[PDB]
């Protein structure tokens, strides 16, 4: 699981780092 911009913490919580 990964997002476009790991920077955007919102996008992180998603996959949960």
From Swiss-Prot:
Coiled coil: none annotated. Disulfide bonds join 1-15, 3-11. This is Endothelin-1. The chain holds residues 53 to 69 of 212 of the full protein.
